[PDB]
């Protein structure tokens, strides 16, 4: 009946801790030696076979809002972007009055100036390059949004954020293509994966596994609709900090991939004007062919069902006997008001009014509408304005100019999630709930993937009472 | 696999008795990973302190500290030899008032430590380390025995082969 | 017969020089504010420091050759350098500065009472982020920040302009000094003298060790040590060579003297844009009468304080001695006039009413007591503001401080004095003189680090014993 | 009982029983024991992008890691890697301070005894290195 | 490192003479020695600060330490963390080599020896630690 | 029975790539004021280095496939990046320069010297820190660093000003090369091929090993190799593919040739303050007249050394082929003119005289005799001076050398050549046309890291034995 401490190295005991994660991406990118991605350049290779064990009989508590991974991932992507644009030309010298004459395409009225009118502004200006004593008059086919009327004059515009921020042009060579990034924990640490088929933002996650490396979390930054992300399993899942609270954002994860065909159907000849010693400012030379409106194609039926599905879950989350309004964003940052995301290296400010507009009766028919022909289903095209000057999402002092991508641009992203925002607005006799689209927080975008991951440390050493005792005998012979 | 698992299995379960194996595997996985990492750093050689570079560097240091600290304790406790090591320190009812069957067959390792954490320090950081210090002293204090050394020398004088000759006669 | 016995963990330490790290209090974290000294970067301070005492020990100390002083000298200046590194450079700001006597054209507020000239309302045509736009803008520069130019009664310019850059201090960063705990890496330790009186260099009977220094506020002050540590029931005087004059004389006080300092000016902030995403902050309008900055000091307290110091100095330079407290002869305003930072605002005070004392050796030394507060006018120190500040060891690299919106209130604790013995021929009359000193971040560091020294711990040890390695 | 360096003034004998106290804090350090911090910085976050202090803390860490390792490596060369108090077969030398064990362990403190042996130390270390060579050689003959 | 491998790799036998028992401890000894010399240097200058060379030395220090650990970790996996030359219970799968033990030790150099085994060398290591477990499981039955 | 036994420290290495740390005596750290290629960082070299000779060891060394050359190149470039990072930039100085008054006295001064206005009393309406006030100043700029504009016989600018940023190097920083010992970390080793002459790639008979490389000077030169190493008993020609014409021909000499070089002028070092805390450095008149920089080569020694190289070239392409040392083909001046740095000052020396010799195997030559020891033994190299150095790899990132005060004198040790074989139509004529080359600093490092090869150290080793783990078997 005598127990003595017996130290065991390798006991299966762990503790919720935080550690410096390291990136691990496929080596193929290193072999291609493109090294144009704003990350992955020095990112180590990934274990060909992911190593995961089943934590059976285990019940770990998981909290998305308290997942330090999201905070770290946020800092990582923020720095990676800064790192990439750190050594690239700035548009600080380009800060002059811009004589923005409308594109000669206005002379070609055709049909409402072809696709769009005033979207592109052939602006001219006086610049001082490496030669300071000598000034130079140059023209740049800038788009709208990037220009702001200044003197209230007809052809008097200026680069947006000329004084509010320092416009830095991202090096044209660099490529803004998110490639599967796998965050990995160092030895003595382990990412816990909420394996539960369905899991609310916070709470004990039953079905649970673990990984030493996150799945390929593409650092895709997109507003409202989450493109190219992790699809929900079987059931669309809505996650909020405080659903009843309005300020809080609402993370809706779609179970099915709504493929979106976005393209920039304009053949573009890119130009470059030298501004500063060994510094060249890239702009657009000419829009060869009729100027057409950039647009994205999405099956109404698919989206109609997707809005039907989410609506049901929103009803389950709140009052199943309440009305539900998908009103469009109530103003705010252009990114928040209109779906935005990167495609081919150009950010597409695309309208999403058509997407978020339909409403639903608590007792309305809940059937999945089928297609009624190519013309019947058609596609939800979106008026898109390309804003090259892109400001930081959480800082005003920093803004980045975007090099024009020469030639036709086209992408095929999968819609995998949607950020919404509940607004009670004193619903008359309640029985109503508005869910305008949300976005603008990169963290929110990262949570959509780390929703299951949870970093924990490991403690192999362990002591326990055992009838056995250390034998005081020391002499080998006696 | 890099993972011990078997956390849910309560202490004493065949898995908890076969932990040694999974631990030998893990200790090995550490090299399988370290060697892999080293091989790459030899090829890519992008150890440049980049955004990921610094991360990799911090990560490398953390792993070393983890391995070193756990081994240091083992060494001071006189347990550097193998994972499992019985010690001479008896358990106090204050540390726990449960039968071995309870503390084991009934408690999982995670659950167990949780209760002992309140005493974990006094158990090993103090008494256990002291035990070894006293043992070490007694060792050399017993190595000054003159007759023992002379008899021990006699053993090396024949290198304990005389007994083998007896076996040869047998 | 004996055999070497390897003893691991022997309690033996040796003087060493190593890098140290700061461990700021976790309360600073909670505040969630950007400190210039990166108090947030500093690791959390261990709740209770371990001050294990080394009994039966007599460790010698050398405060004048301590590495930590030099190491921190660099650490504090680097912290400032990296803090103001990414801030507006105020480079284009310098141009032609046409100025007026006061922001008030006449006695609009208090021209008569207001120190005429202290405003020097200078106007200038600066270029905004738009390269093709020039704008006339006005600003207020205390005489200490404007130099007459072209000998034009109204033409002036920034003081350290032409010579070096004057980057404005990033406005978000706070300059509130937070206690800092320099901690030794594992395998290293800091030894602390507990002796109630310590010369600074020599043996120590009460010696303790700490893995972490006590909290030290990195305050930079001249002719004075503010918010510093206190001696023990005795003012202590330390100098590498007391019989030498140049060697600045460090004094640690046993009693703290309160110093209330404030800016009685309600000021506003004007963000003149100078460059894309670069906003220069200046004072827009002062709301009300203009009152010069000052500091309140007790007569008796300061009197009693000097008395004790004077005695210590006679005990240092022969009993029979007359300690004459003179002021600084001349040199950089930094070391001529007592200067200190207050709520993100530099203050140059004329401590003439703190360093004016002859005191005959044969005089009443009875501790002066307060009889009537009305009669005991709290010494008021004439204080001004030098917004542009300059590095102490470097001619170039000057820095600007953005104005703070509103009146500022400070109340630090006098805790030390820096002095410079001058061997005037009058010494033949035993009239010892100790002019105020300063001008060296190191002198301030030596005052707070005298009791600490860092030693590497060597756990490896050998010893002879009758025990022998047995093969069997 | 005694603190980290509590046996500093204690005789070599008394201090010999407290060796573990120091050995326990050779690698154990506040920065290393931080693990997860109650601060936005997580495991030194990212060295705060190599801050003035981030470097210091990083550097200070490597010195604790290399130093402890160096000390172990030594004991490892001397064979008694895991052991704390070892027993060498190196015969003692009279020149190394002709003193009786009573004075050494009941009077001289480790700090004092070291200062004396400092003059002749590295030599002893080499004598152990070659003694293990002889030991390994002898053991090899037995293995054969 | 002064006498770093003072004697070059001869026939594994001639190399496995006193040379191995000595050079090994001398090599590891001088390795620590030169590492200790670096400690005095960085203590004397303290100029190593994220410089082209400062980053080089910092990464080099980390490399050496982690490469030392991997070697020692491996010794630990097959309970050989004590003696530099530890025997195992694993027999030699003739597939690894048919070479006469004499030749292996009389007409073969370590440099050549490892290559023909570079394929199995890793396979062997796994058997070495797997057996260590078999032996421990047996020790776990010897109840000692 | 055979039981595998683990052996620690088995003498086995493997070609590896490892980060190398510079090790210099740092004897210049005491002179903290003086900084050179980060001398302070370089940890002091071991006072007693020992080369362990690898007896009965043969190894292959690929002087070209040598990672060290690559690392040195990256470290050398990064060193310059760090040195120029905090230094000033001539961005605002790229103004229209009214370059006139080539020289004060176009009569007695330049007179016969081929000066023809090398320096120019160039004046320019540039601003200063005052910003508001704009002042015109005059500074002598070398015709080499200046480029004419509008051909108005007046408007001029800096050769790279419009297309490249010029960063003024900090004057306090010296550019004297110091011995840098590239030391490998523990667990790694640098093999040393000790054959008398090494083809550059192949099995090496004599092989040794070093913990650190021998002192290697960071010398950057073109068409020549200065303060370098010497060959063994014989000039050695080294190339990746000699029979290929493009591959640069690396030659290493067995003996050294003194190259007395000096700028024989007393120069006043005028400095111009432009921009807050920014000061440009230039020349304030030349004290006295202008003497053209020149280099002294032993006429006979050179004749002999060239003959030695020629004989080896015969041994490389058949004696039948005549060795024709032609002058540089053409291209950037850096390569066209043997250009090096003297005492922190960059030279540009015409090398036509040193490369104008046809060594026809069919012509008899009994070496050369310096009977006229006094005179007629100094091939005076017409040396020009340049201050604006362009990055050897990129178009941008140029650097200005602040003028040095007084006469700049030096004496290096020619220790080899960098040559270029030409695909001429005279291949049938058998006339190996070899012309001097340069512009690739990697070659400079190869010429010194040729005898080194970094390899990993794997101490752990396995070996079958007749012994078994019986000791631990019983527990
Ligand atoms: C570096 O050193 C070399 C060697 O000294 C100098 O060049 C050689 O100089 C010698 C004279 O000292 C030259 O000799 C002359 O060559 C003529 C050409 O024929 C050559 O080839 C035939 C092949 O059958 C040989 O038989 C013959 O000997 C030569 O090698 C000969 O026609 C000359 O013959 C005689 O007549 C002349 C006068 O016409 C006399 O001066 C001679 O003494 C002799 O009686 C003679 O042999 C030799 O050709 C040179 N070689 C080259 C490569 O040009 C370099 O000039 C020197 N460089 C410098 C810069 O100093
Ligand atoms: C065992 O060793 C013997 C000796 O090396 C091997 O026999 C040799 O086989 C090779 C290759 O075909 C021949 O070139 C030799 O002539 C053989 N020598 C002798 C002495 O017979 C044999 O193959 C080995 N067996 C295995 C399977 O390892
Ligand atoms: C230098 O020595 C190498 C050998 O180390 C010679 O290279 C071999 O030459 C033969 C015949 O010329 C070839 O078939 C081989 O392929 C070559 N390489 C090897 C590795 O054997 C070489 O000819 C010598 N000379 C030069 C200029 O390289
Ligand atoms: C102080 O000195 C004065 C003058 O001698 C004397 O009258 C008085 O009693 C003394 N005591 C006090 C008030 O300290
Ligand atoms: C530059 O321009 C100013 C203003 O016209 C003039 O005074 C000055 O002489 C000019 N300098 C040169 C070099 O022409
Ligand atoms: C070169 O060509 C000549 C022709 O005269 C021939 O005699 C000689 O052998 C060839 N090769 C050598 C070794 O020079």
Author numbering:
A (entry chain A): 32 to 146, 150 to 309, 312 to 321, 321A, 322 to 395, 395A, 396 to 464, 464A, ...
B (entry chain B): 520 to 689
C (entry chain E), F (entry chain C): 33 to 146, 150 to 309, 312 to 321, 321A, 322 to 395, 395A, 396 to 464, 464A, ...
D (entry chain F), E (entry chain D): 519 to 662
According to the publication:
The envelope glycoprotein (Env) trimer [(gp120/gp41)3] mediates the entry of human immunodeficiency virus (HIV-1), the cause of acquired immunodeficiency syndrome (AIDS), into host cells. Binding to the receptors, CD4 and either CCR5 or CXCR4, triggers conformational changes in Env that ultimately result in the fusion of the viral and target cell membranes. Here we report the cryo-EM structures of two cleaved HIV-1 Env trimers solubilized directly from membranes in A18 amphipol-lipid nanodiscs. We suggest that the MPERs assemble with the gp120 C-termini and the gp41 α9 helices from adjacent protomers to form a membrane-proximal base for the Env PTC.
Extensive 2D and 3D analysis without imposing symmetry constraints yielded two 3D maps notable for their recognizable MPER density. These maps are designated Tri FPPR.1 and Tri FPPR.2, with average resolutions of 3.4 Å and 3.5 Å, respectively. The MPER of Tri FPPR.2 chain B is composed of two helices, MPERN and MPERC, separated by a short turn and flanked by α9 and TM. Immediately following the α9 helix of chain B, a sharp 71-degree turn at residues 664 and 665 directs the MPERN helix towards the α9 helix of the adjacent protomer [Protomer 3 (chain F)]. Sandwiched between the chain B MPERN helix and chain F α9 helix is the C-terminus of chain E gp120. The MPERN helix breaks at Thr 676-Asn 677, introducing a slight turn that directs the MPERC helix to the membrane. The initial few TM residues (Ile 684-Val 689) appear to retain a helical conformation. The MPER of Protomer 3 (chain F) is poorly ordered in both Tri FPPR.1 and Tri FPPR.2 structures. Relative to the nanodisc axis, the Tri FPPR.1 and Tri FPPR.2 ectodomains are tilted 30 and 20 degrees, respectively. Second, the highest LD/N values were observed for the gp120 glycoproteins in chain C of Tri FPPR.1 and Chain A of Tri FPPR.2, whose C-termini potentially interact with the well-ordered MPERN helices of their respective protomers. The Tri FPPR.1 and Tri FPPR.2 classes differed with respect to the tilt of Env in the nanodiscs and the specific protomers in which MPER order was preserved.
